[PDB]
């Protein structure tokens, strides 16, 4: 039952950039038990906490950092 958290998204970035859709789509209600919409309602808040750099991954808008 993974939960969408600030610290959880940081690991996603340092590992590989992501888009809001791609960041939330991965979580999904599969385990977090969070609706496809709610998962976003709780992901949007954490996204900004990342404070990464905007870039296009494979022609896709991806915001993230790279250690």
């Amino acid at each position: 039952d993974v939960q969408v958290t600030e610290d959880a998204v940081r690991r996603y970035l340092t590992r590989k950039p992501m888009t809001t859709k791609d960041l939330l789509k991965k979580f999904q209600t599969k385990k977090t038990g969070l609706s496809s919409e709610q998962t976003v309602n709780v992901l949007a808040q954490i996204l900004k906490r990342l404070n990464p750099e905007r870039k296009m991954i494979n022609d896709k808008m991806h915001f993230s950092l790279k250690e």
Partner: peptide
Amino acid sequence: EDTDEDDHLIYLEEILVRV
């Protein structure tokens, strides 16, 4: 029904780093 799942998906996309 009107699957408005992506509707907000783009809205929150801006609040992040796409204002």
